[PDB]
Design a protein around this ligand. Sequence first.
Ligand SMILES: *[C@@]([C])([C][O])[C@](*)(=O)[C]([C]C1=[C][C]=[C][C]=[C]1)[N]C(=O)[C]([C]C1=[C][N]C2=C1[C]=[C][C]=[C]2)[N]C(=O)[C]([C])[N]C(=O)C1=C([C])C2=C([C]1)[C]=[C][C]=[C]2
Ligand SMILES: [Mg+2]
Ligand SMILES: [Mg+2]
Ligand SMILES: [Mg+2]
Lengths: 244, 250, 222, 240, 211, 233, 231, 235
Amino acid sequence: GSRRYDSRTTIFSPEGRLYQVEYALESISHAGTAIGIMASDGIVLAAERKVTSTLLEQDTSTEKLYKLNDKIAVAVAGLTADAEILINTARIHAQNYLKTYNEDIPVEILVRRLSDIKQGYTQHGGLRPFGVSFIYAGYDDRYGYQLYTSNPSGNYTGWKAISVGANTSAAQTLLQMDYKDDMKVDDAIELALKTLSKTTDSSALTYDRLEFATIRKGANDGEVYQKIFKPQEIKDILVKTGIT
Amino acid sequence: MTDRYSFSLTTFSPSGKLGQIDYALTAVKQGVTSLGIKATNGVVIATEKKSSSPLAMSETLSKVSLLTPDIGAVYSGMGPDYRVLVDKSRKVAHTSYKRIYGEYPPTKLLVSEVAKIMQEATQSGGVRPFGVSLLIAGHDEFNGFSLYQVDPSGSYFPWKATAIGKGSVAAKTFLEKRWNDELELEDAIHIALLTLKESVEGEFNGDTIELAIIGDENPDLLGYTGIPTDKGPRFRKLTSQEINDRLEAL
Amino acid sequence: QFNPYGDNGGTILGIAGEDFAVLAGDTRNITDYSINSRYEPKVFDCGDNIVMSANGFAADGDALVKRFKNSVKWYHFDHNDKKLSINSAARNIQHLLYSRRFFPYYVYNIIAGLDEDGKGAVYSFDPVGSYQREQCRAGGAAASLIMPFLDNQVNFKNQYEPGTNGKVKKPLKYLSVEEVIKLVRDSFTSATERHIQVGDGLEILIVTKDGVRKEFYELKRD
Amino acid sequence: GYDRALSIFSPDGHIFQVEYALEAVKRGTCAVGVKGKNCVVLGCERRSTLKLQDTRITPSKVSKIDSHVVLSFSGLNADSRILIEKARVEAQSHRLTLEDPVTVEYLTRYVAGVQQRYTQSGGVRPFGVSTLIAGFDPRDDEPKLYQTEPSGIYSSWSAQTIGRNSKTVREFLEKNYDRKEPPATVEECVKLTVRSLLEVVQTGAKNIEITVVKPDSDIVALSSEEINQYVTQIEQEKQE
Amino acid sequence: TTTLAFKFRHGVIVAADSRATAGAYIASQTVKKVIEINPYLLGTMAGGAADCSFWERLLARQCRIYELRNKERISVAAASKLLANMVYQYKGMGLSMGTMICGWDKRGPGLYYVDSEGNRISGATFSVGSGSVYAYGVLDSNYKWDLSVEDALYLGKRSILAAAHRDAYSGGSVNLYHVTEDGWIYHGNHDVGELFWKVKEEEGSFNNVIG
Amino acid sequence: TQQPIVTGTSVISMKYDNGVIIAADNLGSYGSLLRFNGVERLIPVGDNTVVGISGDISDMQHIERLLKDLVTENAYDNPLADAEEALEPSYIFEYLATVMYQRRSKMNPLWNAIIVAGVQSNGDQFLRYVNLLGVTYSSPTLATGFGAHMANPLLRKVVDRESDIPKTTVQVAEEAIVNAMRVLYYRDARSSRNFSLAIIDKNTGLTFKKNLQVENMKWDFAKDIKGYGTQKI
Amino acid sequence: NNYDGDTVTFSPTGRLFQVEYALEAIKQGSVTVGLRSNTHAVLVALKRNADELSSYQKKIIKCDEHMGLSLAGLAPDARVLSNYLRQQCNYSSLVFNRKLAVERAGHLLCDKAQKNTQSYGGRPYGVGLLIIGYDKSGAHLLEFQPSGNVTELYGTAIGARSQGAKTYLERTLDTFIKIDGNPDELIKAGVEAISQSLRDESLTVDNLSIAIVGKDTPFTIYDGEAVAKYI
Amino acid sequence: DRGVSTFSPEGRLFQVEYSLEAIKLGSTAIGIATKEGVVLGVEKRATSPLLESDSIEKIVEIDRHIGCAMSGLTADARSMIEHARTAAVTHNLYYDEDINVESLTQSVCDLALRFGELMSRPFGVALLIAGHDADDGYQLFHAEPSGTFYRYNAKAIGSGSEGAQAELLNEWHSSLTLKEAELLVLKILKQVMEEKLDENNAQLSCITKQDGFKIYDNEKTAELIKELKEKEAAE
Ligand SMILES: *[C@@]([C])([C][O])[C@](*)(=O)[C]([C]C1=[C][C]=[C][C]=[C]1)[N]C(=O)[C]([C]C1=[C][N]C2=C1[C]=[C][C]=[C]2)[N]C(=O)[C]([C])[N]C(=O)C1=C([C])C2=C([C]1)[C]=[C][C]=[C]2
Ligand SMILES: [Mg+2]
Ligand SMILES: [Mg+2]
Ligand SMILES: [Mg+2]
């Protein structure tokens, strides 16, 4: 019967690893690098678009940075199509919470929910897991500014600074070196771009090969603003920090 | 009986590759060339009508398809897969949008829905991926004109101009030299015909080429008068004669 | 509007002795003012020395008996031909009745046999499963005519010993099978006189350690 | 639905998927449980390969199932969340239907039953998780400490460890822990728990987590400085 | 029917009549309205005979499984709650039950009132049935915590008698139970006909009646 | 739950020494309208059973099809279908009685009253009744609807109890049935003159008589009846 | 070889190996004999024990007052199939007031076993059955194979060493068929038939199991000192 | 791979045969039936000295008149015990009586072969079911994952089973007392166990008509162990 053709996606190896999860992580390691840095007065999200073309319409393009709600955003590393499935689920979950409790969803609760969905695909159903790793950047009134990551295993952890995708080993070393606790957003912006500029596989880091976003309390009085940077605005911040 | 294939047929290999998606992209590569170019006041999509037999009436086989009055689509790869995707794309435009908001979806969101259908064929049980890449050209009020590519993985990207299928690498190079941000629609049609001639071997005329545009509103194609706000479809398929007229000034 | 219930009349009577038990019932079947049958059996040998009668709506009564007979059959299959005790049958019948709590069997059920000490046993049920063991019980159309007579002549109620004047009761001496059948026949002859749904014939089933025996007696056919 | 039998017997009478789930537990960070005379202490290892971590928001290793019971684990982190959620739901369901909080033995029996169910159900793999469940029964002052594993077997322990290098810390506990006279105070119990982790951990900085559970729903997590004082005292006595 | 139960120093007394009625007709006079759930747990029956009987036997099985699983006797509170949740499923469907779950557990003597309407109430004194209103008068006036077992058994018996006399749908005989920490003890069947005359003479009550 | 539309009236029957007789008129009434005049309400099953049906005709036609299908199904993988393992009156009845009671228990009854008349393998007479409620009974005489009120009294004068059955011949029994059908034609407003009669004998087998008429009717005394009390002319 | 992984796969010569392997389980089972006359039908079964402390596994199962069988192979599969027969016999009685024909009982078993040989996921039954009964056409004996094949016979035997008893019955055919109105002599012929399949061990009091059904004889099973008469 | 419900060429179910191998790895459990009662005993086999041995529950009550000992993958037994307890209590609900030991055993064995592609695999545990009823008296059954159950006068399951069974072959007779059976289980357990038998690593239990199913205290078993040592030293 059909058993003959079943790959058995949800089994342990003799060493106690999940085959498909490990191979999904291998896929993600070839994806464009995404970096998240948390500061005292905000969060930075930086990400590298993969070998683009001159004929790609950049200003209407979005492959890395997505908005989950007004307070929370995500950087993607892996299969974009798989990520959009999860992103829409997270957007719905955030709205369900808001409808139920009349309060914006705490960041961790949203992260746990998505991570639980990923976990399910590794334990039951016989389907391949989602080949996606997220960096969650968000704010709530309990813990303030928060950075999380999740991977196909469905395991998630909190960070002060973190990278996913390609060259994370090199990127994490550079972040661990220059990061300090009393750091500010403007400094974190500079750190993120400098780290991408050194880890990138491209010849030079340009505006057309980047997606950038900040979450700042730099909004008029006690409130939070999400800024998805435009192509011209990425070009300006590259000149300001002294990369181009 | 029962469908007992409740498991994925597309899985990650040790190298991190999704084999069936790669193989689907290979099928797209073998397919006939199709392209899309975006102008300031319009979009053009074009392809070759590769007739399987001269006894076959190639007019009955439509490679360029209307999805909504302001959105059109063309493909490269497996024709039957494209035909069912067009049926589903047309339906989802109504069920997931028009029946809710009372208006047709913007290009990017219809593309998003088509992409979702193609992603699910890449993860769901007992199915293979669609063996096609789509080029979807369209217009809407708040985003203006736009051109999107959709791949077997479900990934989609917006383009100023592009090409897919047999001679895509050469065609994309040709488009890079000719494309600028000040092109009028007629200039884009002219460039589309030049680009397409390079990939075609045999006859090159209005009967062997299929070409459609997203441009100005066509009140003559609306089918009724009396409502000022309803000005007609922006999608228009060029006739055999209309193509031949532009081949003389080529 | 369709009424799924009916009333087939009839009356039944169970009396328990010291080492025996009887279950009697008239053989008349009726609808409204018409007679369907002058002889339509209403008391059945269900097996394992148990007799049973479901009186009221005959279609529901026939179904219940049919199900209990079936329950006895499967009790043997599942438990190595073990004999179903009268107390175990009663509990089983409760669950048959309550399984239709929201569309009841419109019947009053009585079973009779011998308990595990060999003594006579009678159990009576309400239409939805409430059951109780008793020494004497009449059910059906003329139940209210017969029961007071049995309280007086079986349990010696309101009867005292002459000379004492209400100070000392009549002692509860057990009855023989011959004395019991007399009370049964007089009960049904009296009920036949004053109740229009009772008559035609009387069929009595007697249960002893030796088995199940039958006795039939005619009644007035008016 | 996906019905495939993933956990099955092999010719030698082994269920490899359950045994491979134990290998996932062996890979997991070390967890230790020690019960004193009037308390239970749960110690947990934090691997220092991950720095630049935000310790405020990172999921803690010890999880409260109810106000009087806690659960720590070793193995797949994502798998542990599913067991913890189920346990928490059952704890409230028990209070709701029986008007008493769960006993530690009951909660353990439930969690172990869930684990077992995933070893003979179609289309699912076993949990790659072993748990240590500790606490005090309602209106009781006797300490409780149980362990579970992927196969679904569970048992009570005077002291126990699970995870990577658990063989070493179990060796330490077997010679140091006396049944006739267990850790009489909280200090003695915590000290023994820290000592046991210091055999394996590496550095005694932010790598050791300690959670003390006392009777009548008195649960508290020690801070870095409080634990660091134990690490200091232990090594100063060792220099002799 | 008339049933009652009350907690006191030395446990809980449980009493009930034995009459069953089908309209004005007295169907039975020997019915058992107290139910034996376990050696330490009793349940009363009022309203639907079948309903009360079926669901409390269902509860008893539920309680027995609990003992096997947990190696521990169920509490009075948990038992009453299992019943309450069971009948709550069928609310508005036509069930008719008024019960009392009486027992001794780790918390001492326990007494819960449970009905088909959905009420579940802990209390020291309850009476349910058509004759409850007559029984309450005797209970409330004579009930104390410091009551002897002899006096407590009489109170529960005398209270049923009051109701059996006045209420047309109550009578027959009195069944008595005493629940201790060592389990429940049956204290006999007492015919109301004989009991009435005895109590009249010894107590002096019921002066209006002639005998 | 429904209401009957097109209906059939009385079915009457009785036992005699060697078999059973059953009869029913050929009318299908539509309320007070005597709509259909050629309706057969006696339906033979094999050569040993006749099922007589009263009540709703659409439900009758449904039952008629169940019985026709029952014969077909019994012959499947049955070499003794025309011999030892042929359908018995008791098998046919119990099947119908099962269906009737099941349908009433779903509150969607077959609005009929049925009499199954036949002779068993051992020569024993079979005569049993079943209706929309699943109520069953047997008696030496059986009748449905108006027949229960008017025919049974006449047939019970011939066979009052079980011991009168051997004393009753086929000529006497048929005579009684034919007289009962005349009385029903006098007194039942939903009856017809035309009827069918079936005899199932253990010796001579199944005799099915069609197109029978009520005859020897008394109407002459009507000429003398004038007015409603005081009128003389 | 490559075509025995499941029941849904024919081999290149048109064989179903999983069914043939299920057939093999019957040959490993203990011997049981069936035979009949015109008035009665008899089952004789050699029961098997695990060891001296153990009981002797029961081989004969009653289905109705007029029908029953003996098993050889997987006992749980016999419990499932006999339960199905009990239900079918019971459906026939409750609905049609009719005792189920033995031939029709065989047709129902055939069809139930067949479904397990043509569908993926399931497995064939691993047991052989000998059904006896007395119905309206007299005494009957059936042999059931889990391939689905059911056969009506005068006599037969299944299980280990069953060929010896089957040969004996083939010789005795003309004799035992005539044993009418004599249950003890028909059982004697059955006990003598099963004896031809014995090696080393002999028929003891707790080893032998006999069952009979007939004209005025309900299906009854004889075990223990009740069969000492026939030893 | 291959089906879960597949027959081998010898006519055996692969998975059932493989589960029997898992049971051979399990700790020893012994049962002896007498006219005065049935005794059940088990090897606890703690993996470490820190493990509180009294929490090891390998002897289990099903009803007041039925007990049960297990050997093999003991986690698999929990749902079998749960079903058995439910079956026993449910029958008491439907029939107002104790359930026959054989009928209870048959109910447990009906679960055994409910596996395929229902549960995904057979049970990896064997059960000794001991009890008493009025019809057949004191009984001992051995329930396997094949769905088969044999009645036994005496039976041993687990790692030291064939060695223990041979010993039970010689020692058992129809006139054994309860005390004699208790010492006999302790004797044979001590013989097949790796570690030295004491009250902490071994557990006794019995079922009598009067007192019902009882698990023995460690203090009570300790005296029976001391009584065993002295009687072996007596000759
Ligand atoms: C008092 C006598 C009256 O409240 C007392 O409550 C007793 C309680 C009791 C009796 C026997 C056993 C245990 C407890 N109650 C009865 O005697 C009731 C009276 C009653 C009938 N319906 C009802 C009652 C009380 C309160 C609500 C609803 N008797 C019964 O329950 C019995 C006799 N059942 C029936 O009479 C019938 C039922 C049930 C039923 C009938 C009659 C007909 C059709 C379907 C069901
Ligand atoms: Mg696709
Ligand atoms: Mg009259
Ligand atoms: Mg409940």
